[PDB]
From a paper:
Signals from the Hedgehog (Hh) pathway are transmitted across the plasma membrane by Smoothened ([name]), a seven-helix transmembrane protein belonging to the G protein–coupled receptor (GPCR) superfamily. Cholesterol binds [name] at two sites: one in the extracellular cysteine-rich domain (CRD) and a second in the transmembrane domain (TMD). In the absence of SHH, PTCH1 inhibits [name] by restricting its access to cholesterol in the membrane of the primary cilium, an antenna-like organelle that projects from the cell surface and functions as a compartment for Hh signaling. Cholesterol can then bind and activate [name], which transmits the signal to cytoplasmic effectors such as protein kinase A. While membrane cholesterol can modulate the activity of many GPCRs, cholesterol plays a unique role in Hh signaling because it is both necessary and sufficient to activate [name].
To understand the relationship between ligand binding and activation, we determined the crystal structure of hSMOΔC-BRIL-V329F in a complex with cholesterol (bound to the CRD site) and [name] at 3.0-Å resolution. This hSMO protein [identical to the one used in our prior structural work (7)] lacks the disordered C-terminal intracellular domain and carries both the inactivating V329F mutation and a BRIL domain inserted in the third intracellular loop to facilitate crystallization. To stabilize [name] for structural studies, we included an inactivating mutation in the TMD. This mutation changed valine 329 (V3.40 in the class F Ballesteros-Weinstein nomenclature) in human [name] (hSMO) to phenylalanine (V329F), which corresponds to the V333F mutation in mouse [name] (mSMO). Cholesterol and [name] occupy positions in our structure similar to those reported for complexes of [name] with [name] alone or cholesterol alone, showing that these two agonists can bind even when [name] is mutationally stabilized in an inactive state. We compared our inactive-state structure to the structure of mSMO bound to [name], cholesterol, and a nanobody (Nb8) raised against activated ([name]-bound) [name]. The latter structure was proposed to represent an active-state structure because it revealed an outward movement of the intracellular ends of the helices α5 and α6, considered to be a hallmark of GPCR activation that allows coupling to downstream signaling components in the cytoplasm. Opening of the cytoplasmic face of the TMD, stabilized by Nb8 binding, was associated with binding of a second cholesterol molecule to the TMD site. While it is rare to observe substantial conformational changes at atomistic simulation time scales (in the absence of enhanced sampling), these intermediary conformations have been previously observed in equilibrium simulations of other GPCR systems. Together, these structural and computational analyses suggested that [name] can adopt an active-state conformation even without cholesterol bound to the TMD site, which has been presented as an obligate driver of [name] activation.
Residue numbers in the entry: 58 to 479, 487 to 657
The structure:
């Protein structure tokens, strides 16, 4: 109807000093600085407008704030009545201009109070066209897809090429990834090729574990080398709009990111559980030294179950929560790149676990080796003490010599009685055999104490038979069980520890990244906000000053993690660097020629 009394306020009009409000020419000629609390002059108002216009970055917000700001700072005043802006004009900004309520809060007069912004006002800014759609400041890029938007800023996503690192740093990390990826690709393939060439003999535990291990590092390397194909890095890492890929799998985008993610992460996680299977193979290889062999072939089902099933669960679980993200420096897609907390439970947890489990089996194995190796050495020493003191008693002129050699024999026999090979019926006869001998040394000692040297020496000759009838039989068994330890057994443990070291390095890199990522994100937001904040409230004078990023991820750490990941692949590929396999390839060349 004709203008509602509540949709306007009694204020003295002054003619306009600017024909234009934020780019757009105005349909009236008089204004009032009543509606703007912060402004008392028109010139002051205009300067405030120049501060608001730092929201040009944030288009989604800019597009609704422009009309609201005119309606407040440059409102129409006609015949001592100023036109108030409608509620629906003010509320429309609350959503997309949420960065305002975060960074400084909305001023009193821009909060959608019913008194200040009445209901159903014909605003008059609706007749003004605000042509400015708005742009995104570096490192954001303009996009209308809401899945690409960076937090409170809407309309802007992070550029595909990692803003935290220069182009120089990218090609350098890519050179590094190329070197390690390719070499590991060649090493693992060569090593896989030798297994399939001699498949009949190769596919047998524990040597076959290293085949599956090398398979994982081979499949993983493909995923890592993908990016170096012409235009692939951009297809895997960048979105259609030109922002980074984040939160995959997302609906309209291609599968190239999730493909590369599955290739790398599944292969990585399977390789870690195959490593634990290697450390278990090594721990149980010593328990075979017992009467029951306990075959690895029987446990093959349990291995193939865990090694393929567990990565599948983790991969599926990741795909379900949709945490696949791309990175231009690494050139692959992975879990938890953006959301670092998911990287904890899907990368740091499993590696933490394979460290504890694999490490347990590695420690528990060397404990078995060193314990076995010392128990024989100790028995050997006691047995050698017995034989040396028997010679002394044989040669003895007198009782003092005999008593001395016998007390030493006694001590060695009691000590040897304590030893165990690595209430048992075998142990009963072992401990009893020494009980007999100690009791015979006992008898011989009495003769020696009484002075009967020839009697004592005669008694000592019976210890020789007692020794041969029991203790000899068992000492030979102890020697044979430690001889059973082949070089392929120990070589497996050497590889286990060599792999464990790399795992421990990888873990520490991820741990380091996890610990410092939160600051790296904070440092980015502060840099983003700085770019908009520094363009306003600054004199025109010299060029606007560039901002900085406090902190970022360490490329040395990334290069260390890469050396550890690919280094394991290379080290594990040296399992076939033997005489035997040089024969298998030379067998083939003659065949062909
Ligand atoms: C295992 N080694 C990791 C270390 C961390 C590396 N890393 C994490 C990452 C990657 C990609 C995207 C995001 C991300 C996107 C949106 N909001 C917050 C973060 C984070 C980054 O290099 C970047 S890029 C970026 C952009 C903005 C804010 C911080 C930020 C960071 Cl830190 C990857 C390799
Ligand atoms: C990612 C980027 C675009 C977000 C940053 C937008 C910046 C420029 C925004 C956020 C909060 C805004 C401020 C909100 C309130 C006021 C008080 C007013 O009396 C003068 C302008 C001033 C001081 C604004 C200037 C512009 C401002 C600082
Ligand atoms: C055959 C595979 C095994 C069984 C099925 C696995 C899960 C299937 C569901 C996948 C979800 C995929 C996209 C749909 C919305 C998921 C929101 C994601 O929200 C998230 C939750 O926090 C998840 O816990
Ligand atoms: C701005 O408006 C003019 C007409 O006044 C038009 O030619 C132009 O395309 C508009 N600009 C944008 C970015 O839409
Ligand atoms: Na005022
Ligand atoms: Na997808």
């Amino acid at each position: 109807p004709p203008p509602l009394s509540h949709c306007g306020r009694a204020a003295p009009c002054e003619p306009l000093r600017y024909n234009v409000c934020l780019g757009s020419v105005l349909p009236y000629g008089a204004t009032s600085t009543l509606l703007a609390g912060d402004s008392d002059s028109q010139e002051e108002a205009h300067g405030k407008l120049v501060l608001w216009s730092g929201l040009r970055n944030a288009p989604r917000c800019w597009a609704v704030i422009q009309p609201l700001l005119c309606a407040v700072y440059m409102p129409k005043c006609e015949n001592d009545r100023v036109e108030l802006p409608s509620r629906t004009l003010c509320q429309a900004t609350r959503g997309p201009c949420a960065i305002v309520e975060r960074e400084r809060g909305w001023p009193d007069f821009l909060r959608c109070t019913p008194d200040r912004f009445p209901e159903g006002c014909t605003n008059e800014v609706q007749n003004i066209k605000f042509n400015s759609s708005g742009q995104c400041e570096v490192p954001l890029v303009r996009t209308d897809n809401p899945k690409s938007w960076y937090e409170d800023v809407e309309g802007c996503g992070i550029q595909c090429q990692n803003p935290l690192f220069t182009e120089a740093e990218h090609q350098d990390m890519h050179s590094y990834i190329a070197a390690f990826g390719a070499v590991t690709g060649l090493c693992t393939l060569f090593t896989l090729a030798t297994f399939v060439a001699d498949w009949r003999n190769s596919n047998r535990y524990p040597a076959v574990i290293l085949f599956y291990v090398n398979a994982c590092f081979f499949v993983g390397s493909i995923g890592w080398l993908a990016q170096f194909m012409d235009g692939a890095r951009r297809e895997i890492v960048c979105r259609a709009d030109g922002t980074m890929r984040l939160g995959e799998p997302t609906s309209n985008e291609t599968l190239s990111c999730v493909i590369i993610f599955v290739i790398v992460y599944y292969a990585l996680m399977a390789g870690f559980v195959w490593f634990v299977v290697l450390t278990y193979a090594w721990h149980t290889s010593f328990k075979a030294l017992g009467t029951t062999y306990q075959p690895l072939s029987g446990k093959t089902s349990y291995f193939h179950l865990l090694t393929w099933s567990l990565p599948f669960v983790l991969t599926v679980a990741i795909l379900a929560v949709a945490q696949v993200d791309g990175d231009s420096v690494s050139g692959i897609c992975f879990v938890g790149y953006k959301n670092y907390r998911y990287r904890a439970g899907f990368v740091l947890a499993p590696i933490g676990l394979v460290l504890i489990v694999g490490g347990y089996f590695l420690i528990r194995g060397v404990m078995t080796l060193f314990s076995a190796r010392r128990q024989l050495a100790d028995l050997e020493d006691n047995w050698e003490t017995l034989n040396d003191n028997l010679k002394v008693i044989e040669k003895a002129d007198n009782a003092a010599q005999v008593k001395d050699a016998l007390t030493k024999m006694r001590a060695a026999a009691l000590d040897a009685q304590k030893a165990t090979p690595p209430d048992s019926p075998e142990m009963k006869d072992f401990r009893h055999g020494f009980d007999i001998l100690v009791g015979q040394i006992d008898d011989a000692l009495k003769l020696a104490n009484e002075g009967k040297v020839k009697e004592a020496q005669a008694a000592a000759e019976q210890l020789k038979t007692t020794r041969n009838a029991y203790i000899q039989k068992y000492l030979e068994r102890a020697r044979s069980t430690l001889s059973k330890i082949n070089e392929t057994m120990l070589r497996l443990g050497i590889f286990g520890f060599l792999a464990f070291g790399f795992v421990l390095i990888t873990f520490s890199c991820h741990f380091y990244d996890f610990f410092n990522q939160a600051e790296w994100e904070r440092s980015f937001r502060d840099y983003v906000l700085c770019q908009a904040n520094v363009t306003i409230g600054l004199p025109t004078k010299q060029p606007i000053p560039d901002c900085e990023i406090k902190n970022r991820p360490s490329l040395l750490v990334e290069k260390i993690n890469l050396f550890a990941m690919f280094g394991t692949g290379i080290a594990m590929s040296t399992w076939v660097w033997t005489k035997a396999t040089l024969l298998i390839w030379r067998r083939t060349w003659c065949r062909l020629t």
